[PDB]
Amino acid sequence: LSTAILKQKNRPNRLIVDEAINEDNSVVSLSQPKMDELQLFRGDTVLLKGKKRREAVCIVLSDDTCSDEKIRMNRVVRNNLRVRLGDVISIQPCPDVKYGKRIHVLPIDDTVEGITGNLFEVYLKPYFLEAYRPIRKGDIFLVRGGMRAVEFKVVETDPSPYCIVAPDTVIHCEGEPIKREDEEESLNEVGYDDIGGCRKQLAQIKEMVELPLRHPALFKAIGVKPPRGILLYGPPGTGKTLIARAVANETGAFFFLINGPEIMSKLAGESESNLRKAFEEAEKNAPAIIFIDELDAIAPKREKTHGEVERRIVSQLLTLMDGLKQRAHVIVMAATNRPNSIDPALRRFGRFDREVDIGIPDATGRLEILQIHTKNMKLADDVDLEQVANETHGHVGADLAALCSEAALQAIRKKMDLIDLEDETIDAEVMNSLAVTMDDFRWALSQSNPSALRETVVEVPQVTWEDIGGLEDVKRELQELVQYPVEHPDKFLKFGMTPSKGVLFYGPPGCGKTLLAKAIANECQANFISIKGPELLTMWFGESEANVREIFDKARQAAPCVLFFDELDSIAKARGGNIGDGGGAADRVINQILTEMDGMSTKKNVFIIGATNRPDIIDPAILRPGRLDQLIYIPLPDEKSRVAILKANLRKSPVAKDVDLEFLAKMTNGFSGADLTEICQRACKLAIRESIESEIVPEIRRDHFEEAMRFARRSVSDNDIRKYEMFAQTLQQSRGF
Amino acid sequence: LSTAILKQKNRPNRLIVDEAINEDNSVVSLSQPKMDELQLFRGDTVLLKGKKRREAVCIVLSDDTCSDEKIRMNRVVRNNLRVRLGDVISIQPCPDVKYGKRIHVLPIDDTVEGITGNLFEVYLKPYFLEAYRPIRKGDIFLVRGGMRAVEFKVVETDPSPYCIVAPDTVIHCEGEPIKREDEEESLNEVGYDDIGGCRKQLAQIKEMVELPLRHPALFKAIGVKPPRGILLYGPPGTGKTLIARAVANETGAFFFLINGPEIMSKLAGESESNLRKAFEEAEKNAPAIIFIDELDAIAPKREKTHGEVERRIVSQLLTLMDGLKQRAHVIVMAATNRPNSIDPALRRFGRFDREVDIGIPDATGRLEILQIHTKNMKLADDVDLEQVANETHGHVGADLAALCSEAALQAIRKKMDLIDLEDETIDAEVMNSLAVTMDDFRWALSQSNPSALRETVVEVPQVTWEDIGGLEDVKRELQELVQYPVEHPDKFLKFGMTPSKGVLFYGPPGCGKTLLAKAIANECQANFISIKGPELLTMWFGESEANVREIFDKARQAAPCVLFFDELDSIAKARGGNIGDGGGAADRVINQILTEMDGMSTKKNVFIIGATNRPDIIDPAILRPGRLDQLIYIPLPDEKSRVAILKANLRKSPVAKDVDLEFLAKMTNGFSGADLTEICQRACKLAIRESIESEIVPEIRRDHFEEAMRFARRSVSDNDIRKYEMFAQTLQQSRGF
Ligand SMILES: Nc1ncnc2c1ncn2[C@@H]1O[C@H](COP(=O)(O)OP(=O)(O)OP(O)(O)=S)[C@@H](O)[C@H]1O
Ligand SMILES: Nc1ncnc2c1ncn2[C@@H]1O[C@H](COP(=O)(O)OP(=O)(O)OP(O)(O)=S)[C@@H](O)[C@H]1O
Ligand SMILES: Nc1ncnc2c1ncn2[C@@H]1O[C@H](COP(=O)(O)OP(=O)(O)OP(O)(O)=S)[C@@H](O)[C@H]1O
Ligand SMILES: Nc1ncnc2c1ncn2[C@@H]1O[C@H](COP(=O)(O)OP(=O)(O)OP(O)(O)=S)[C@@H](O)[C@H]1O
Ligand SMILES: [Mg+2]
Ligand SMILES: [Mg+2]
Ligand SMILES: [Mg+2]
Ligand SMILES: [Mg+2]
């Protein structure tokens, strides 16, 4: 429902494309049963429509040699118009265009090779006799008096719109033909298909941008105001600017583009005028989209800035933003990677209010990007992109761009024998055969460019219950605390209770407190934000406490979300202990957390979870009803669960059939799940000491586990086990003395 | 494979040089079996190619008197063209150049001595009869009507390109002949051979700079984008600017050079124009390289800078950087020693993204520099440069330059008798004989200029296992933790384990924890970054915590790397102890380390190692699985290892045959390896008390060791030995209470 703009199917006038024989591109197909639906008439022009604007306007009709539900058409219309198969041509005629002084007439490429003379006469002139030219600017097709093809372009403008011309007219061949490059920048020009990884954010942009522009009567009918303020933001390199020029190409609205730096590089008293000129050009031209790219360049905080020409431009922009009446039909967009450095006044109601967040893409989204990049490359058969896309984490769209680049250049090194640098233009017997293998993507993925931007990430964890041995009651217990209130709202208001929003895990180390949290976030299919305690205490050597307020906020957009504060013992030991230097646990971040924890509605779909293995030093305030009032003690695994731990840890290993698991599980008593996973890691570490020596077979054996069990060491003491059972019994008391 | 651009061999047209008799340099050699490969024709011109551009274009062919695979040629072509032997002349003809108004005609040196008149007529005129002048500007050769040689230069330009001229023409002798200096600045001009110590960084510069320029079709073919943003950085004096003018001389691309200060010294509103003029001059001239030297002069952070003419130039540069379309074929380079003071916006994708790091050279690299400097000097026979290059550590390329200088000037002092300062031009009987001895390099290497830039260094240690007595299991044990995952990736994914990334050494003082780490970094041949704890705590009196984030980053470029945090006890005692003032160990840097330690992939090739001799105060958080979960206790040496310690410590000493080692080893019980090394140092301290007295023989004797053993003192207590065996047994428990 949030994607509902992607919906496009079932338009009667909407149909696919297929073969033509006719290499004079004047023609356009028909269909006999389709005209039955249509108004179509003999002669002049159709408006056929397609991807990314530009279209073809020329003579039409007679066909049906090829069958129908598909459209005949001249395969040059594929280099023009769309990319290729499967999409739609959209046709209605636009008849009887005006008769002018004739139009255009200039070549591009192959006319310069060979004998020219007066050109258009030499080759093309016989082609128009009483046919005369329904035409549009931008058509490039093959025509000759000769070897049977050369392409051709357009120059002159008598009117701006397209014509059906007459003779007696004056035209000119007097120009110079041209090179390719002007064509590629038409074909490389970006559409909605070059962006990948953001579906959810495009659905919000067309609802905000496109829909009010084309259909202003809608909001006018239900009586609602369109926002004029869209503000895009995200980390560097995430494709913000890219979504700009996509929407530039995809609109029927005049598009003006302001570069923040380009405004500031100007002289004083002048750059004040460039803005005033940009808001005047749009308002004149009916609907329009102004886009101010890199906004925080021109508008930082009036409280920290120096020059008076810097403070005007910010007060200049405010005075234009309020000069927008709905009558004008103008939408102002903007893009910034530092949304918190923007002047606060710009983000208030009536200026920039709607926000759209372009985030770091996840493993699905970054696969979609890798495919948009490499679709021009030639790849080997050993290339598994679903394998690559899994191995790149901190990478945003611009890193995958520089990843595909460092792999191609690694392939050019294996070829450095057959390339010379002393030669002028090298042979093409390598130029064709040079392809990119997976052995390269392993090399690029290990290099510098893997250095990438990495900060708070919000995603569904990949760990399911199947990764967790034992603990079957808490799995049951958690599902109630999280699923049912989010899944079944009817049950709770009925019986009159309000759900509780928070949970505290406690127990000995290594018993799975982290796994339980990531697991339930995957079952509810909610988002997961994880902040380890040592990260709370680090940032304040630079002294920024807004980063805690920023995390609760960030989880609010991501609702439904579980917000998991891990290793709370590290914060309560930030003083060293209860006796310690003599502080309590509450200081620093904890007072800022208990505050922000209370600003969240009990109806909220965000759900907080703590964890600590030091229940003695957690301060009384965290445990209050309304904060984390659900306490759950996770014990060491018993003997029957140690069976279940060992099994799940080995699901990725080539264990032998003869290894007897429940033999281990009952000889290991004070071990936690961290200890058993450590046994398995050494067992495989003794299997490799064979494997390399066995060279100078490969399935881990029953002897190795025997060997590992010797050194194995119990991580939880005999006194610890007891003491946890003291807090396991009553930690409610705690607070109050 | 990363060096693959150095590859140059097997070009058919590529061959060496050898003797000619012919002192009229118009000629150029041939070969009879080589022309069989060639197209070579009789008369006019060849393009012969060589080192650092400039070449010779003149008559060619007839030879074979001298044998082939070598080339005859006139030894003046050696002062021109290359330096000397062993390199290549590269030849193809460029026939039939145009017939002009004649060209040049002006002398340099020896014509001013003697009788001139009208010059060119007096001596050189008979030399051209129906031979007429295939020629190029820059040839300097011997010609006379007279004593049989004087050299000669070029002045006029009728066309820019070179000519085969005719008579009836008008030329002029009307200029004034000239001094040498204009020639030396041609010969001292810097090539790729003046730089030394960076091979790995040049391979990256030609892949980034040269290859896209000469061969833009390559990246166009495999469909990849060349970077326009190369940014060089490093400490002062490391030869950044030097790599600039090398690439200046070595390119066929127009080279423009911006000096940062020279931009800023200009008036306001003007220096804005000098940049705009510099990006316009390049774009006009096809491929081109703009180099902005000392970048951080013009572009510091827009958040800390004052004047508005300082903020324009930064927004001026941003607006030019984005005005670069690939069509332009321009690469913008830059150089800075303060990469973290550059405005953040310049380093984002699409502006300056590729980085190349010119580091402090190591002992090999600085030997290569010393040889590039002293190759003009006359050296004595006592000079061992491999000995000098070992003794200079904090020295970068510009210190070795000022080292070779302070040694030459020390040699001029021993000569101060035969030099007078009251004389005008001193005698040359010293001017020839003055040479540089090793007794000087000892003096220079002890002086001020040894004061040098010294900070974090990344290198393979010079200590191998042979330096370490005993500890044979940990040597085995370490190799698995480090080598096999880096050497044999096949074994680990097979059995399904992920390797663990970190190790914690603990034990009593002086037992070799430092040696074990440096040793395994040498065996894997990986890089070694060492940060002693007291260095973590010092910088924050200036309050900079980015230096911890900067160390993990720095180890990431250096992968494979071992990152060794030494003396962690000093950090955990930064409060004084557990009871202490009442803190825990975690504060300060430790919370910033545990954070940065987690941002490193388990697939990473960087490997972290800690060490502490105070296992009681290390905080629980370091030991968590995923951080340092491998604990290894290094015990005091037993009796059989104390034998092995004493032997390795003495490998550099003239021990007598009669000294009985295992006698010592069993009378020393509570001693650690630090204690035994201390015995050996006093034993040699008692040998020198003889040696000087023995003057008023030299091999250390068996008596001395007897004498030292008396005072020897046990550094580890009797209660310490026990207590370590308590933590040696269970330190896993630790965390959790
Ligand atoms: N989601 C995406 N899908 C496809 N390509 C992408 C995506 N994101 C980035 N790219 C590519 O990588 C480059 C990233 O540049 P942009 O996204 O335009 O810069 P940005 O996201 O505005 O970040 P800045 O400019 O540093 S604040 C673009 O040239 C794209 O070709
Ligand atoms: N019940 C369990 N089932 C499966 N694996 C477990 C279990 N308990 C612990 N482990 C293993 O122990 C490791 C750490 O588990 P966590 O969930 O991080 O434990 P924790 O409660 O966070 O305690 P620490 O101190 O952070 S190790 C994981 O790699 C798991 O494979
Ligand atoms: N790697 C090297 N090989 C040979 N000579 C070097 C090397 N590095 C420095 N030198 C010499 O020492 C001088 C160092 O100056 P540069 O390297 O040009 O300055 P820099 O490295 O840009 O440092 P700055 O200017 O203080 S940021 C040069 O004149 C070189 O002659
Ligand atoms: N096993 C050993 N073999 C050879 N030399 C040793 C050994 N143990 C200690 N030493 C000597 O002791 C000195 C210091 O050794 P380190 O490796 O620094 O010991 P450590 O574990 O760092 O303890 P400290 O407190 O730093 S001395 C070196 O000069 C070594 O020569
Ligand atoms: Mg941008
Ligand atoms: Mg954990
Ligand atoms: Mg410099
Ligand atoms: Mg040491």
Question: Hey, is A630 helix, strand or coil?
Answer: strand
Amino acid at B205: I
Could you say which of A264, A398, A408 has the minimum Cβ distance to residue B315? A264
- Report the pocket of ligand 1 as residue ranges, CB < 6 Å: A 194-198, 236-242, 337, 369, 372, 397-398, 401; B 348-349
Q: Which two tokens stand for residue B678?
A: 């201390």
Residue A24 sits at φ, ψ, to 5 deg, of -90, 110
Residue B114 sits at φ, ψ, to 5 deg, of 100, -170
Residues 6+ apart with CB under 8 A from B628: B502, B503, B504, B608, B610, B622
CA of B440 to the centre of ligand 3 (A): 23
Strands in A561-566's sheet, in edge-to-edge order, are A527-532, A561-566, A606-612, A502-506, A630-633
C-alpha A647/C-alpha A680 separation (Å) is: 10
Residues 6+ apart with CB under 8 A from B214: A421, B252
The per-residue DSSP string of B247-279 comes to: HHHT-SSEEEEEEHHHHHTSPTTTHHHHHHHHH
Cβ proximity of B384 and B436 under 8 Å: no
Could you say which of A261, A416, A580 has the minimum Cβ distance to residue B315? A261
Sign for the CA dihedral angle at A19, A22, A26, A31 comes to negative
To the nearest 10 degrees (0 to 180), the angle between helices A702-711 and A673-693 is 120
Q: How many residues does chain B have?
A: 737
C-alpha B306/C-alpha A305 separation (Å) is: 10
CA angle B594–B595–B598, rounded 5-degree value: 85
Residue B573, judged by CB atoms within 10 A of its CB (0-12, 13-18, 19+), counts as middle
Residue B472 sits at φ, ψ, to 5 deg, of -85, -20
Cβ proximity of A700 and A684 under 8 Å: yes
Q: Which chain B residues contact residue A440 at CB under 8 A?
A: none
A574/B592 touch (CB, cutoff 8 Å), yes or no: no
User: Which bound ligand lies closest to the C-alpha atom of B518?
Assistant: 4
User: Which bound ligand lies closest to the C-alpha atom of B505?
Assistant: 4
CA distance A313 to chain B (A): 13
- Quick one: CA torsion of B204, B206, B212, B215, rounded to 10 degrees? -140
The residue contributing the CA closest to ligand 3 atom 23 is B237
B242 lines ligand 3 (CB under 6 A): yes
Question: Hey, is B359 helix, strand or coil?
Answer: coil
The residue contributing the CA closest to ligand 3 atom 19 is B237
Residue B376 sits at φ, ψ, to 5 deg, of -90, -20
The candidate with the shortest Cα–Cα distance to A185, out of B327, B123, B383, B534, is B327
CA angle A485–A491–A497, rounded 5-degree value: 75
The per-residue DSSP string of A234-278 comes to: -STTSSHHHHHHHHHHT-SSEEEEEEHHHHHTSPTTTHHHHHHHH
C-alpha A31/C-alpha B471 separation (Å) is: 88
Residues 6+ apart with CB under 8 A from A241: A293, A335
**What b/e sequence results for A511-527 when a residue is b if at least 16 CB atoms lie within 10 Å of its CB, and e otherwise?**
bbbbbbbbbbbbbbebb
Residue B60 sits at φ, ψ, to 5 deg, of -145, -160
Cβ proximity of A675 and A510 under 8 Å: yes
The candidate with the shortest Cα–Cα distance to A436, out of B222, B607, B542, is B222
B226 lines ligand 3 (CB under 6 A): no
Residues 6+ apart with CB under 8 A from B592: A538, A541, B545, B548, B549
Cβ proximity of A622 and A577 under 8 Å: no
Q: Which chain B residues contact residue A573 at CB under 8 A?
A: 584, 586, 619
Is A515 annotated in a binding site? The answer is yes
B107 lines ligand 3 (CB under 6 A): no
Could you say which of B225, B345, B737 has the minimum Cβ distance to residue A720? B737
Residue that the structure tokens 């990334």 belong to: B501
Is A514 annotated in a binding site? The answer is yes
Could you say which of B218, B583, B591 has the minimum Cβ distance to residue A534? B591
Cβ proximity of A500 and A629 under 8 Å: yes
C-alpha A359/C-alpha A558 separation (Å) is: 11
Residue A731 sits at φ, ψ, to 5 deg, of -105, -5
Q: Which two tokens stand for residue B411?
A: 């040699």
The residue contributing the CA closest to ligand 4 atom 18 is B514
C-alpha B275/C-alpha B292 separation (Å) is: 10
CA of B255 to the centre of ligand 4 (A): 55
Residues 6+ apart with CB under 8 A from B464: B519, B522, B523
Please name the residue of chain A whose CA is at the shortest distance from the CA of residue B731: A715
The residue contributing the CA closest to ligand 1 atom 10 is A397
Residue B379, judged by CB atoms within 10 A of its CB (0-12, 13-18, 19+), counts as middle
The residue contributing the CA closest to ligand 4 atom 28 is B674
**What b/e sequence results for B106-119 when a residue is b if at least 16 CB atoms lie within 10 Å of its CB, and e otherwise?**
bbbbbbeeeeeeeb
C-alpha B58/C-alpha B139 separation (Å) is: 10
C-alpha B261/C-alpha B258 separation (Å) is: 9
Q: Which two tokens stand for residue A572?
A: 């309560």
User: Which bound ligand lies closest to the C-alpha atom of B640?
Assistant: 4
B470 lines ligand 3 (CB under 6 A): no
- Spell out the long-range contacts of A708-711 with Cβ–Cβ below 8 A and sequence spacing 24 or more: A708/A679, A708/A682, A708/A683, A709/A664, A709/A667, A709/A668, A709/A679, A711/A682
CA of A241 to the centre of ligand 5 (A): 5
- Report which DSSP code applies to B414: T
A377/B222 touch (CB, cutoff 8 Å), yes or no: yes
Residue A404 sits at φ, ψ, to 5 deg, of -65, -25
Is B373 annotated in a binding site? The answer is yes
> What domains are defined for chain B?
12-96 (2.40.40.20), 97-177 (3.10.330.10), 190-359 (3.40.50.300), 360-455 (1.10.8.60), 456-635 (3.40.50.300), 636-716 (1.10.8.60)
- C-alpha A110 chain-centroid distance: 42
Question: Hey, is B705 helix, strand or coil?
Answer: helix
The atom of ligand 3 lying closest to the CA of B401 is: 12
B349/A402 touch (CB, cutoff 8 Å), yes or no: yes
B224/A421 touch (CB, cutoff 8 Å), yes or no: no
**What b/e sequence results for B474-507 when a residue is b if at least 16 CB atoms lie within 10 Å of its CB, and e otherwise?**
beebbeebbebbeeeeebbebbbbebbbbbbbbb
- Report the pocket of ligand 4 as residue ranges, CB < 6 Å: B 468-471, 509-515, 613, 637, 645, 648-649, 673-674, 677
CA of A525 to the centre of ligand 2 (A): 21
Amino acid at A273: S
The candidate with the shortest Cα–Cα distance to A520, out of A474, A557, A551, is A474
C-alpha A710/C-alpha B734 separation (Å) is: 21
- C-alpha A494 chain-centroid distance: 40
Is B237 annotated in a binding site? The answer is yes
B224/A306 touch (CB, cutoff 8 Å), yes or no: no
B401 lines ligand 3 (CB under 6 A): yes
Q: Which chain B residues contact residue A534 at CB under 8 A?
A: 586, 591, 594-595, 621
- C-alpha A9 chain-centroid distance: 25
Could you say which of B312, B575, B625 has the minimum Cβ distance to residue A264? B312
Residues 6+ apart with CB under 8 A from A614: A569, A572, A573, B736, B737
Which chain residues have CB less than 5 Å from ligand 7, an ion? B 241
- Report which DSSP code applies to B29: -
C-alpha A266/C-alpha B319 separation (Å) is: 11
The bridge status of strand B502-506 relative to strand B355-357 is unpaired
Cβ proximity of B26 and B56 under 8 Å: no
Q: Which two tokens stand for residue B224?
A: 């990849």
C-alpha A272/C-alpha A316 separation (Å) is: 7
Residue A258 sits at φ, ψ, to 5 deg, of -105, 130
- Report which DSSP code applies to B107: E
Q: How many residues does chain A have?
A: 737
Amino acid at B33: P
The atom of ligand 4 lying closest to the CA of B467 is: 4
CA angle A592–A598–A599, rounded 5-degree value: 95
B491/A680 touch (CB, cutoff 8 Å), yes or no: no
Question: Hey, is A700 helix, strand or coil?
Answer: strand
Residue B49 sits at φ, ψ, to 5 deg, of -120, 155
Beta partners for residue A254, in sequence order? A288
Q: Which two tokens stand for residue B197?
A: 């110590």
Amino acid at B369: I
C-alpha A353/C-alpha B94 separation (Å) is: 69
Question: Hey, is A442 helix, strand or coil?
Answer: helix
Residue that the structure tokens 């909407």 belong to: A14
The bridge status of strand A231-233 relative to strand A152-153 is unpaired
Residue A550 sits at φ, ψ, to 5 deg, of -80, -25
Residue that the structure tokens 């061969």 belong to: B215
The bridge status of strand B502-506 relative to strand B606-612 is parallel
C-alpha A87/C-alpha A14 separation (Å) is: 9
CA of B151 to the centre of ligand 5 (A): 59
Task: Give Dmax (Cα) for chain A.
Answer: 108
CA of A527 to the centre of ligand 5 (A): 28
A715/B737 touch (CB, cutoff 8 Å), yes or no: no
How was this structure determined? It was done by cryo-EM
Could you say which of A426, A537, A677 has the minimum Cβ distance to residue B591? A537
For residue A598, CA distances in Å to A501, A548, B23 come to 10, 13, 96
Q: Which chain A residues contact residue B597 at CB under 8 A?
A: none
Residue A234 burial (CB count, 10 A): 22
Mutating to test ligand 1, I would choose from A194, A195, A205, A241 the residue with most ligand atoms within 8 A of its C-beta, which is A241
B236 lines ligand 3 (CB under 6 A): yes
Cβ proximity of B130 and B85 under 8 Å: no
- Report which DSSP code applies to B637: P
C-alpha B502/C-alpha B239 separation (Å) is: 36
Could you say which of B5, B215, B545 has the minimum Cβ distance to residue A426? B215
C-alpha B576/C-alpha B589 separation (Å) is: 16
The candidate with the shortest Cα–Cα distance to B357, out of B377, B383, B336, B375, is B336
3-state secondary structure string, A286-337? CCEEEEEECHHHHCCCCCCCCCHHHHHHHHHHHHHHCCCCHHHCEEEEEEEC
CA of B400 to the centre of ligand 3 (A): 10
